[PDB]
Amino acid sequence: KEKARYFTFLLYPESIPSDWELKLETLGVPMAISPLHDKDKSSIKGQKYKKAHYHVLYIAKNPVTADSVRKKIKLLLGEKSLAMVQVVLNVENMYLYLTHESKDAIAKKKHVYDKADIKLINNFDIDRYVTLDVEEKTELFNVVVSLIRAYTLQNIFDLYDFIDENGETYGLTINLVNEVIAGKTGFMKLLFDGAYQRSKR
Amino acid sequence: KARYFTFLLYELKLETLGVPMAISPHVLYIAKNPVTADSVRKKIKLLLMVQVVLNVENMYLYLTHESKDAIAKKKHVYDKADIKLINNFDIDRYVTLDVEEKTELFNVVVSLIRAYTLQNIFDLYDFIDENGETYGLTINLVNEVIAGKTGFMKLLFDGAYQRSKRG
Amino acid sequence: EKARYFTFLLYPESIPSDWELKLETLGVPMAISPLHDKDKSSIKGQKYKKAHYHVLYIAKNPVTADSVRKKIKLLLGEKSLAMVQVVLNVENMYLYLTHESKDAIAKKKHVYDKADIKLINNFDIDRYVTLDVEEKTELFNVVVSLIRAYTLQNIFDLYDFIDENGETYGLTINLVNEVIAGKTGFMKLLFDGAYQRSKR
Amino acid sequence: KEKARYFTFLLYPESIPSDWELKLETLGVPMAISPLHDKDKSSIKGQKYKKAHYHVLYIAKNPVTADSVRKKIKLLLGEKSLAMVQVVLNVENMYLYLTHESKDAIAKKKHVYDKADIKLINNFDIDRYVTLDVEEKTELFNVVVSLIRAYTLQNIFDLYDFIDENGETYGLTINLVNEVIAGKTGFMKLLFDGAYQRSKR
Amino acid sequence: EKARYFTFLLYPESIPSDWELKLETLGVPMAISPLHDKDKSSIKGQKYKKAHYHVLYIAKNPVTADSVRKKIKLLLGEKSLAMVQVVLNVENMYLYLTHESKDAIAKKKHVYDKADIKLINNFDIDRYVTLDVEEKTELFNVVVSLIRAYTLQNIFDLYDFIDENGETYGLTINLVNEVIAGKTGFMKLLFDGAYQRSKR
Amino acid sequence: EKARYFTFLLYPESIPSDWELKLETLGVPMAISPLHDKDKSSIKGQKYKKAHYHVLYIAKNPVTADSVRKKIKLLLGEKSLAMVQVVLNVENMYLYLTHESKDAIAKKKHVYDKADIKLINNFDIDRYVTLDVEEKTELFNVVVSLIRAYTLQNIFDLYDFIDENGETYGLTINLVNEVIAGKTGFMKLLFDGAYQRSKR
Ligand code: NA
């Protein structure tokens, strides 16, 4: 299933303990807690505001799937604590949505929130998540290698097709691999050469 | 056409355009969109030649005569902070946007080669001749985007070459 | 997987006021960057990135990475850090403390004054660079001799040989990838040689 | 009918009026006049010297045709006053050629002349026309690209032959092609590869 | 901060009697000036500056200046010198040894006898004056025309041509090796051009 | 101040009988001189110096000199040696072991036999001597002529030839690897020429 490093979920005060804030910290995970949403427009005719809720941005180190994260926070708070967990694809925009200031929330006239009420937890630094510095690129590259080995990918088109089909399972996009393999084309040639010989074995 | 321009004169009316600039002890002018240099040079003169800039960094330092052309015949190195900067101009700004559009344009060139199975640089060039504008692309600007990425290019064309023979 | 050089980040908000002195207690050589409080940020609304420190950490023997995780969280406070990465080029990471790497400087980023670097326990940058290059040079020479002995025709055969016998020669897949990066032209020569030699 | 702004042509004292300098200034266009070329050895047999002549560096105000200027000077200076009106591609080499100090002129050990005999008209300043070497290498390259495409040049010998025959039309010599493509051989390989396959179509 | 050519001063007053031999011990080639005992001294007073030597020192591979200073300090004493300076033009520094560089002559400095230069460990200046950019491209262009003229398909054919007719064009095998190093991509294009041209 | 190459004296009078074996205990490579039993002494009337050995000691990493002295004091006795000297040219000291160094020959010191050198812990002099770039450039030019002379079609054929005849031309596998590193494009041109030349 879909595997990513960045996830999000919602919390409602009525159905989680008062101490929820610190129990979130027990996990040792970077998290951004949005300002409480008590002024959101309700789709229910006859109602003014949606139930007050928090948005939570959740960062694992090793890429993990969606159910994993749903499972531990459900265990952490109670089984009546949550429903589903979203996989976040542009965390920079989801961070902005916490204040309804993302390019789509400001676009649909959603209630804006105060960015000072954002509480960051466990050294949440948004900038390290949108940049993917050298150490991350090396791990991503080694992944691409194992993919070319496993599925005997003979050229970059075969690789591209495979990423289109199964990219998210390993946290990969085409524009991502372009960045990762940039300046490594000679290495890329050796792998494709090897794959090529392996497929006439 | 380009976004970075230079010209030379022998203060407030320049701000009237509300367009980023950097005036030396030579004047450097940044358009808001890619625009033709003849156009720009009609506009200043009615206000009060012009050469399109292909690299900003070197001309920023030429406002001091301090880059490789300068070190080649070093003379009369000019002041640093004595520069009039209007309409929020800074150098970090524009070089990092240069980078991002480079990779931008590179990625779309990749998708083109995949989509239409372009086997070599001639087939790519031809496609630019006919359909270039729909993707914001010209021959000279694809040349500048793929310079320094020819090994990447060869990888792509090898792919297309062998996929074409699957059929 | 065991390595010698490591790094991690520290933020002022998450560490006690005596973190520098508590760090030197552990008796390991370390390089600490100047506070990066003027790192220009990509997020369009926070001007500068979170002010932080980079710490260069070198164990004496090749050691586990989570080991390093364990000790610093213990000594500084568990809200202090989360992950320890492992350095492959100390040359650039040492300069990166100051945004004086060629690669980061090529992407600009703010420069800091290297006098604001604090070294702990006689951190000798020249010694770890020189031992890195001659250790990696030998790993390469080892890879060469394996390609000769077993006439390995391409990089897939080499990878397979590593999986089967990597531990015997102190070699992992990810470790050969670092050794042969920037030597692919040499690799091509070796595989070409093996290929023709296997057609004899 | 090719239109450009920079021109050069010959002037013959024999066939121009005494006040010719003052007459040229009236056109109000910047001009550089070479020292009188009276010691150029001539390839015509038996005469040993070329007819004494001046080279004129001509900068029009806006793009204009070559015959346009021919007419302007014929009606100004005389019926046989000038010859070989020519469009200039690099103004700096022509200014150096005025004293036979183009590297291409000294490479043939053409007679060198005194730069102090250069006459400037309407405040011609050479620095106003010099181009940075980086960008000239870029446009010269784009030119070479265009030739390889147009004439389907499959390899560097075919390109060298084309330069031998038609180089001047594009302001190109063998050695300058060598400078331009230095450090771009990977690009060159891509072009010749393209031309090669295209000629098997 | 690494270079190969260095220079520094030595004064007989503050160096051992067998200093010349101790210098040779280091195994690096070096050129030693004639004793500078007659330099007009800008203090006036004593007319001449205290007698001193200039040493031109060539490291085997690039090193720091402090490398060299430390080495001479260990070999000769802490008192023997204060700084080793980095030389950018070996030829001028060699001519300065006798006050015959253009700038020594421009200041009317006392000239010394070139035979009093002491050479150590096969120091030969002609070995370090190399690779003029202007000349390396002209030789290159010559190599190009030879590959065109005689349709030389590969580097063996070129080398054979040099062996037989090199003298005509001022070319030797090793000098071509210098000229084409770092232009091998260009070389390939040329040989491909020749190769296809010989199948016409 | 820390160095890798050291030397010191040992006097039989002041050292244990099993001193040679005790030196092997350290796991450091060492070169021991033939006993200098016939060195002419500047003492009026004594003829010869006290019989002594010179020991060339190769420290594992950069180390301080006093560290090495103390460690020899613990191993052999506190009276075993007095000071440890830093070696600056490892080759020159090794020749000094037999007074076959240029400074020994210049001072006419008694020559000793090279077979009486005792090597310890796989001491090989050729692993410590360093070559200059002019010497590395000629080694490359040498590899070129070998590829020409014996029409070596690939790098395996080249290595095989080095295995068989490397010493004749001052070449080892690993020293070939250093010499051709960063010249793999030139290498491919050479092998192509040899390849096409063998199909002729
Ligand atoms: Na604490």
Numbering used by the authors:
A (entry chain C), D (entry chain E): 3 to 203
B (entry chain D): 5 to 14, 23 to 37, 57 to 79, 86 to 204
C (entry chain B), E (entry chain F), F (entry chain A): 4 to 203
Provide the authors' own sentences about this structure as they appear in the paper.
RepB, the replication initiation protein of pMV158, is a member of the HUH endonuclease superfamily, which includes proteins involved in the replication of plasmids, bacteriophages and viruses, as well as proteins with roles in DNA transposition and in conjugative mobilisation of plasmids. These proteins are characterised by the presence of two conserved protein motifs: the HUH motif, composed of two His residues separated by a bulky hydrophobic amino acid, which is responsible for the coordination of a divalent metal cation, and the catalytic motif, containing one or two Tyr residues separated by several amino acids. Each monomer of RepB comprises two domains connected by a short hinge region. The C-terminal or oligomerisation domain (OD) is a helical domain responsible for the hexameric state of the protein, while the N-terminal or origin binding domain (OBD) carries the catalytic active site and is in charge of recognising, cleaving and joining dso DNA.
A new crystal structure for the RepB hexamer was obtained without DNA in the crystallisation conditions. However, the most striking feature of this new structure is the prolongation of α5 helix by two turns, expanding to the region connecting the ODs and OBDs, in two of the protomers (chains B and D), in place of the 310-helix and the flexible region (residues 128–153) observed in the previous hexameric structures and in the remaining protomers of the current structure. Alignment through the OD region of protomers with this extended helix (chains B or D) against a protomer with a flexible region (i.e. chain A) shows a large anticlockwise rotation of the OBD of almost 180° relative to the OD. As a result of this new arrangement, the OBD of these two chains is positioned over the OBD of the neighbouring protomers, chains C and E, respectively, thereby occluding access to the active site of protomers B and D within the structure and impeding the cleavage activity on the nick site. Therefore, these two protomers must be inactive within this hexamer conformation. Another consequence of the presence of a longer α5 helix in two of the monomers is that the neighbouring subunits (protomers C and E) also present a dramatic change of orientation of the OBD relative to the OD. Since the OBD of chains B and D are in such immediacy to those of subunits C and E, respectively, the active sites of the latter are forced to move closer to the OD and face it, instead of being exposed at the top of the cup-shaped hexamer. The α2 helix faces the outer circumference of the hexamer in subunits B, C, D and E, instead of being exposed at the top of the cup, as in the case of the other two chains, A and F, and in all the protomers of the two structures previously reported. A phosphate molecule bound to the active site is observed in all the subunits of this new hexamer, instead of the catalytic Mn2+ metal ion reported in the other two hexamers.
